Amino acid sequence: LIKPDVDLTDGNFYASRQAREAYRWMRANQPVFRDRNGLAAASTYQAVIDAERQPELFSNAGGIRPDQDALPMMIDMDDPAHLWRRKLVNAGFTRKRVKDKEHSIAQLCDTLIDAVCERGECDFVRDLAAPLPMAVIGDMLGVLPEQREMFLRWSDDLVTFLSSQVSQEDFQVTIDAFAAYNDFTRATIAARRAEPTDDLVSVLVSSEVDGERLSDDELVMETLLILIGGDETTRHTLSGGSEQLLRNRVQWDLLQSDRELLPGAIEEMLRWTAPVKNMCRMLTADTEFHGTALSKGEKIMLLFESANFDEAVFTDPEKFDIQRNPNSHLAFGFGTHFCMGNQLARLELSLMTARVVQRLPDLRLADQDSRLPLRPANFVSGLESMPVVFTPSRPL
Ligand code: HEM
Ligand SMILES: CC(C)CCC[C@@H](C)[C@H]1CC[C@H]2[C@@H]3CCC4=CC(=O)CC[C@@]4(C)[C@H]3CC[C@@]12C
Ligand code: NA
Ligand code: NA
Ligand code: NA
Ligand code: NA
Numbered sequence: 001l002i003k004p005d006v007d008l009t010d011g012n013f014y015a016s017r018q019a020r021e022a023y024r025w026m027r028a029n030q031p032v033f034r035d036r037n038g039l040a041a042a043s044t045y046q047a048v049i050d051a052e053r054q055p056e057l058f059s060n061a062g063g064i065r066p067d068q069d070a071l072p073m074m075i076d077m078d079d080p081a082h083l084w085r086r087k088l089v090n091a092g093f094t095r096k097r098v099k100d101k102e103h104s105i106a107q108l109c110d111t112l113i114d115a116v117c118e119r120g121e122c123d124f125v126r127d128l129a130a131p132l133p134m135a136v137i138g139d140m141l142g143v144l145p146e147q148r149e150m151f152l153r154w155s156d157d158l159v160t161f162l163s164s165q166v167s168q169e170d171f172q173v174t175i176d177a178f179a180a181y182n183d184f185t186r187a188t189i190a191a192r193r194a195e196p197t198d199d200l201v202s203v204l205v206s207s208e209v210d211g212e213r214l215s216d217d218e219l220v221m222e223t224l225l226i227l228i229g230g231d232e233t234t235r236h237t238l239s240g241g242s243e244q245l246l247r248n249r250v251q252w253d254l255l256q257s258d259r260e261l262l263p264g265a266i267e268e269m270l271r272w273t274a275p276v277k278n279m280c281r282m283l284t285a286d287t288e289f290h291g292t293a294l295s296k297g298e299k300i301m302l303l304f305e306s307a308n309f310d311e312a313v314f315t316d317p318e319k320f321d322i323q324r325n326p327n328s329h330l331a332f333g334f335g336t337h338f339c340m341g342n343q344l345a346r347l348e349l350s351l352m353t354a355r356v357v358q359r360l361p362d363l364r365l366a367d368q369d370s371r372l373p374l375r376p377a378n379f380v381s382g383l384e385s386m387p388v389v390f391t392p393s394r395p396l
């Protein structure tokens with residue numbers, strides 16, 4: 001095994017399909033790894049957990065992304081300022097409020113499958129995996145159903161070109177996407193100030209943190225955080241997890257034969273796909289961390305996918321096993337910033353996967369001998385496309 005020569009900010013690393021071999025080297029030889037440019041990364045399950053449990057030393061207030069300033073959103077804040085924001089919107093994502101959405105989310109799943117069932121084929125990414133979480137979080141945000149496609153396109157342009165090697169033409173698209181989203185959302189904020197609604201934008205507009213109204217800048221960025229959290233994450237577990245079911249037919253047959261295996265299947269899909277490849281922390285002081293000296297002010301990447309394949313926690317991690325138990329993956333992170341939408345994501349995954357294995361029972365990849373492309377982006381990433389085939393059925 002040769003040491004990886006990699007740039008962890010280069011989107012191409014996360015699409016090369018040699019990332020997990022690079023992770024394996026890190027976990028065995030330098031758990032807190034420094035890449036070709038010296039960027040520090042926590043590669044082992046233990047190192048990620050230890051960093052998450054010490055927010056006083058591993059801060060979010062420097063921003064969660066490499067080479068990027070902190071923004072006015074709660075994921076870029078430390079406690080208690082971060083907690084004050086979480087409490088404004090936590091109520092919409094509790095176990096009961098999520099479960100009470102099952103009928104509406106199930107209806108969206110069937111509407112989306114109704115749109116492709118007569119075709120006998122679709123792009124599983126474009127036509128099922130991406131639109132379902134978009135519709136769910138769009139409804140909570142007050143996005144009109146006919147404008148979901150517009151918001152998802154903005155969202156895609158905001159994350160799919162995150163890379164130290166981004167081209168000028170892709171960078172311009174990211175800039176233009178934020179400008180359009182910013183203009184639209186500021187108009188939305190003014191509309192909800194005149195006529196409040198029950199969507200999350202109106203909730204944030206009507207909120208106070210420590211007795212102060214949220215700034216218009218923060219309102220735009222908190223709304224965007226909720227949007228991207230909803231529509232650029234679950235989609236990759238839906239597509240990538242379904243792909244592993246199709247590529248490991250024993251697992252697909254197991255789930256089709258026993259529906260009570262669905263909760264465990266969802267957890268293994270989450271472990272395998274790890275849509276959030278990394279979150280950054282900024283060191284507030286010099287420290288020695290798992291054999292690596294870290295300096296105050298530098299950033300360290302928490303490699304969630306690397307932790308999800310750590311042999312110290314998972315037996316035979318390269319085997320897709322929907323019956324894996326326990327399955328304490330870190331797809332949702334850990335600590336005070338643990339994913340607020342973890343329950344909503346799991347229900348999105350459960351309802352769509354159950355309806356896919358029900359209404360597309362003979363689902364297959366259009367070419368089982370192919371290798372599907374992954375998005376070369378350094379933050380969230382998954383399958384770009386996924387052509388599938390099935391026997392047509394009639395809509396419901
Ligand atoms: C498979 C689906 C998802 C994955 C893998 C995922 C992953 C993550 C991760 C890794 C974090 C940071 C945790 C840390 O740094 O320790 C996070 C935070 C967050 N996620 Fe999720 N997420 C998913 C779905 C969602 C959904 C559906 C929403 C809906 C709004 C959402 C909203 C958020 C928010 C607001 C935060 C910031 C929480 C905070 O800073 O306290 N996520 N997510
Ligand atoms: C997956 C979720 C839990 C976290 C979501 C983080 C999103 C909202 C964050 C992460 C990366 C950020 C972008 C970083 C680069 C860029 C510089 C600009 O010129 C303005 C907009 C911005 C485009 C940011 C807008 C939204 C950002 C995308
Ligand atoms: Na790779
Ligand atoms: Na800043
Ligand atoms: Na654009
Ligand atoms: Na197949």
